[model samples]
Target chain A: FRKMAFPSGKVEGCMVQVTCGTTTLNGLWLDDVVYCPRHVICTSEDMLNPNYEDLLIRKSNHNFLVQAGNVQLRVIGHSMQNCVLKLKVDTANPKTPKYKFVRIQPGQTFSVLACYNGSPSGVYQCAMRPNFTIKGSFLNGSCGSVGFNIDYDCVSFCYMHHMELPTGVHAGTDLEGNFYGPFFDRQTAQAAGTDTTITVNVLAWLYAAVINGDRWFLNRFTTTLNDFNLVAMKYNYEPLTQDHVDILGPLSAQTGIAVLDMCASLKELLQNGMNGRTILGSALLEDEFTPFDVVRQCS
Target chain B: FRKMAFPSGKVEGCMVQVTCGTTTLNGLWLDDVVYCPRHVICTSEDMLNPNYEDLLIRKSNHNFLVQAGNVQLRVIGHSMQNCVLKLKVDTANPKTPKYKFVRIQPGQTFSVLACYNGSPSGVYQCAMRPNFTIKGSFLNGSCGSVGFNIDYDCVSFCYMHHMELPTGVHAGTDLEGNFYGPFFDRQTAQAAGTDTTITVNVLAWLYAAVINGDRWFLNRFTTTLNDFNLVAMKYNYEPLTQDHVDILGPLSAQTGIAVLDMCASLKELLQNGMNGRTILGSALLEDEFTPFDVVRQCS
Candidate 1:
């Protein structure tokens, strides 16, 4: 039964390259198998001078698949990355799964001022307000709000302007073949479809790759989650051509930050199986960041 | 004998306001008793329109003592803080003594690119070179070096412009009553004269007080380490009048930042007794920050 979802070769928890005729698609190994659904559309124009023979090809249709050593490369799971995110690695314990996220967790409260502006120096002057009662400096601080009140400035009419890092997540392919991510709940990771702990962990990993410059993690993430080369995830998932990435913006009233940890369950997810291959496959199986569906589940 | 370093009021770990003949010299309860050195001088001119009667007074000279309950107030110790620093809080665990200092610990290395520009967004694209073996994008990252290569732009001839937070610390009293702090080793905390673990923790605490706006911690610091009023520490320690605090400069080759944890010993010191009272007294007894010396040691 597993063979139906995969080729004759044995593959487990890995990202495999796929090519639908001249155009390229992505594949993943789940439970030692993957099911390349029929009529799956594939494109590779996102590549610089991509193969134009087939601008967009269909799975197992007029456009067929290429082959690996013993594997037929085809679009297996739909959940794939278009834009790469950066996660921070713990300098204290880099290789180990032990981690700390710069975000607030659930069921937590701060009774005092916790100011973390943007730099190490921003650590001293932030706040967490209850109801409307407020006290602190007017320059910049992160107050507790619906989301983390980051980079907040003070004024009498200074309404709370909170911008969590995960707000802009979404999943959709534009007519231009541009893939987007969804605003999955990193806090819960409990939703049946759009959210899961894997998304959170992967987001954290992406954050680590970009923020902390854990090339060690990024290289591992590249080899496992993003096939041998980074082209599949980097060029197709989401392009990283922007000059910079700003989580919360400037000119907002909230001009600072206070961090909270990601969920404990997410940490547990990472502690046991932090392998990059597992994360990409988990999201696809859970139906998180992809627009299409995983036609066949693992046996 | 212990009573000689402290007062009868069981003031073993406490900061007491001292009026060195109307000029305030700070006091601490060491060994439950204090030694008001006879020739030590005090000044209150840093105060807004300070008491001119005794522009600067000497300890136990024509300057006599003031009373707080049964405790006579006088300049008890020499080492004290002039500039207050701010440390951040672990919002995930607020009251716990467990901490993570934003500094590099001793004897560790990074092998990847980590970019922590200024915000949470700066977590990627950093580096740690062995013998200046360079390879990374052209933006920013923290490379390994004698000091942290923070905010480092990955350009040729970067020179790894390094700046640690403790660089600006010193202890000196200007004729104008302006006190300065000395840079102590937060990494080792093993130095005899200039550096100690207590200095690092207090620096972290001060950093927490300012950045996170942890009023709960700051208020406790005010009453204990800073006497009943913040005046002794805030004004005399080092005035906090400059609207904001910046650790590293803005424009440098290393324009991004990467963090390291403080020494293990520093964390241990906080874990057992992270009380407000113990810290100020410990720094004084250790003869770390303040300018003068502890005339009397605890028996």
Candidate 2:
């Protein structure tokens, strides 16, 4: 008696074909197929054979590839037989595990676009349950009887510090070697042609801190800006006449910018016995003046 | 004292500039404005004036046009002052009448998109409820104070008859002078070059009848097809082989084709003992030969 060995890391809906001279078997499997040469037949019914030897098992040409990325998984079915593929995420625990099932027709493909919410990372397993409509159908077993493993990486944190600032003036590289903007280094600002760059960089850093929810970064950046007197730079554009320090100081102390409150303030200013152009021109600056401009400059 | 003559078909948010020489009064009207000619001032506080003649009224240069279409009414505010436009549809009935209000900023416009449902025909009235701000403010009145009438013709009915048949073979003009296709005339078919034209024309007529829910048209066309033995004309294209008469007889007898039932039939036909190409080729016709085709062909 010979037993067929299963392959590791096999995807669901994969098919295997076995041929012993004239007799041939083709489909998914559960445990192994036992070949009894003495009985002149290979059957999955007998698994208690003590004289079973290791049967040669090769990767089936008709198989599916489960590609996992971010919060989504793409399941491509290349099987000749119609299959219902089942995928289970975080299967180690007994309490709760996410399960998704999709039906793929023969020679067709599909996607499990959105199943898990938030960030879905960790180990996942997929298996196939063959349909039994014939007398000699392939392993008529329950779900997860024949399966494969998939390791997904869902951690790809990307942030923008100063989205609108010039890259050469205010920029820093992340762990992944990706560049971020508006992080003003005092040493870089001390050089020539970096005067205007200082104010924009400081504004960019403050914007980034609020959106990224980095309290420590915000505190450190704000303290540094005050120490460097970068906030004293005049916001000489339309609709913003206050210095950078006065405008962003109160904002940094609070958690974040309240969009509705800011809009109400703007509406009042626009209707304050002054025309639209007059009010906007004197009170606000150009380059990076309004609260909306600051909000847009961050990610 | 003079009374101002109101304009005809005045839409909401439309402004009227009333200038009394140098002392100009540009706003919407609701009630009498107390004119103290001795003091050279016009005040809205007085209403008792029996000796007041009709004031000279003229169309304002800075007025909006209210365009009504389908179920929506568009109010464009051409006034230099911010105004609130009020609209009412089906004002005669007390049970259910549509009313809408929108605030238009100075030199801006708004839309009363949904005031009535279905085909909203008949006479409707619109008025202005002006805002009372400071000195030199726009109209200062309340609901229906200054109003006008608008006559809207919301009758626009369009239909498609023979969508699939060749042009000019079986076509006719509608009441609106628009050309429609696949209308099979018996007298025209009695002439030459209208052999295959008969089958396609009948099919097109049946499709039109089903979609339009025209029971009389369906009955007349089906009876004519049966009497003319047009059903014997083969569905010669791929996936369609049976004659028109045999395919539509049972369908016409029933109320209408159940979409679910038709899908079940299609699934069974697809999963028949034959392969995909073979089952699709014989059981289904090409170009337009599906359950939708069957549904469209019926009635």
Candidate 3:
């Protein structure tokens, strides 16, 4: 079995050490490596207003969060003798580059290394695993567990620590049925307090209706089964909101999503309502961002 | 709502009277119409065979079961504000078809209409009520039902009545180390056998392996919940056999049948040894056949 790796940034020549059980293997050969290009992911948000006297804030920015970095690659082959993993980065291109050969013995395995770049930032390509096959109590391409090793310094820093801040406003009502302006932000909505029941009800309703819509949409497109076809299941019903971003974080892992760019073409549609378009934009980052690089060394 | 019957051969129209309990209406309409066009309906059996064996059988001159037929359009519109249901045939293609209106008094509401054509040899399309809206449930969509509603005529002329055929062949070793060929053709397979051991084993295995494969495929595609994604869920890896088809009937229905074709494609790939090409084929079909049609309608 070959492990294919698709890296995003430069890979300086690195060595891999495999230590399986008690036996220790020194070097592994890195055979195939490729780099995927980068792309921007975006989304939008909509704010509803309900105000009489207070100023009503309607529109707000969408908060984008990175639950996981780029896709990781894994290397699978015969040369992995021991369980120790080591690698050297091949910094051919500052932007588009690949990893050079690594050493390994039998019983050893290689995985794309992840960089814990402190800030919970940085977009990197992950190692890729081959597609799985099943036939009557049979399975191939088994996904094994590996302690994802990290080398922070060898990773590159591209942009500022851009915070994926969420944007949206809240509306509330007083005890006397008096309507209040939309609380321009989340903080303001939080400050409005424990005394207001109607406001809480309204917010709760919005979250259930809006957030559920987005979450349901994202969940449909990402999953697949052996005999079922789901690509046609994708439908856009409403524009996405901050509630969507919230739900997406938890769902990303299940969907095998490494990075979800809240902003895709459909983001605006997911935000402000469109005429016939039923859904607000709830889009996924391209597979480029969801990279899975696999490295394999033959004995 | 509009009742747009497709272009096909319809049976002779017959009128019957009906009575409603709630409304003071007297005359209700029930028509016995058989719909059969030279353009035959694609049956479930036709869907499983790769050589289009079912289709070939259907298209052959000997397979022309229904010479003339029509659909029983049971319209329960608000306009039927009477007790008795008067059935009518609207066969004139050029002239717009009209149903004879009927009315029934309050006490006269115990009227019943014979929707059955008194013939069993043909097929029918049963459309109860039609509601066109995005919010319309799966039960809606003009709620159409497709089946071989074998009336007396249909049953008498059916292949089973005319011929005594075996159902299927079972090739496996017996407990006594004897290899047996249980020759069960069409007739035998349909009959309930007294041999509990062989029957139970065959059914149990068929249920867990083949039928389950098709059902899971449909459920995964159609379900809106998180667990429904086809790509995500693992399936039983079993090679499909003729026995599999004998269990899971053709996977299509009238009104719209493109879904059956899609399922057929996936079934073929699984049966043909699931490879990289098969995986890609599944993805392509998924992209083509939307889940709503399969999960919501094509049962």
Off by over 4 Å in 1: A1-299, B1-192, B196-299
In terms of lDDT, the poorest run of 10 residues in model 3 chain B is B128-137
Per-candidate DockQ values are 0.01, 0.01, 0.01
- Please give, for residues B1-299, the per-residue lDDT of candidate 1 as tens digits: 00010000111112233344443333322233322211123233333233222433222222434333245444233321222111111111111221111222211121111112211111111222211222222221121111112222211111121112322221212112222133221232321232222232233333322232222222211122222124323222222221111221121112121111211222233343344333321222121211001111100
- Model 3 per-residue lDDT at A56: 12
- Candidate 2 Cα deviation (angstroms), residue B217: 83
* Candidate 2 Cα outliers beyond 4 Å, as residue runs: A1-198, A201-299, B1-84, B87-299
Compare candidates 1 and 3 on TM-score and give the better one.
Answer: 1
lDDT, ranked from best to worst = 2, 1, 3
lDDT of 1 at A294: 14
Which 10 consecutive positions of candidate 2 chain A have the poorest summed lDDT? Answer: A128-137
- Model 3 chain A is weakest, by summed lDDT over 10 consecutive residues, at A132-141
TM-score of chain B of 2: 0.17
Tell me the tens digit of each residue's lDDT in model 2 across B234-295: 32211222453355445444646432233233223223422323221121211212222334
lDDT of 1 by residue, A1-299 (tens): 00000110111112233344553333322222322211123233333232222433322222444233245444332321222111111111111211111222211111111112211111111122211112222222221111112222211111121112322221212111222123221232321222212232233333322232222222212122222113323212222211111221120112121111211222233344344333321221121211000111100
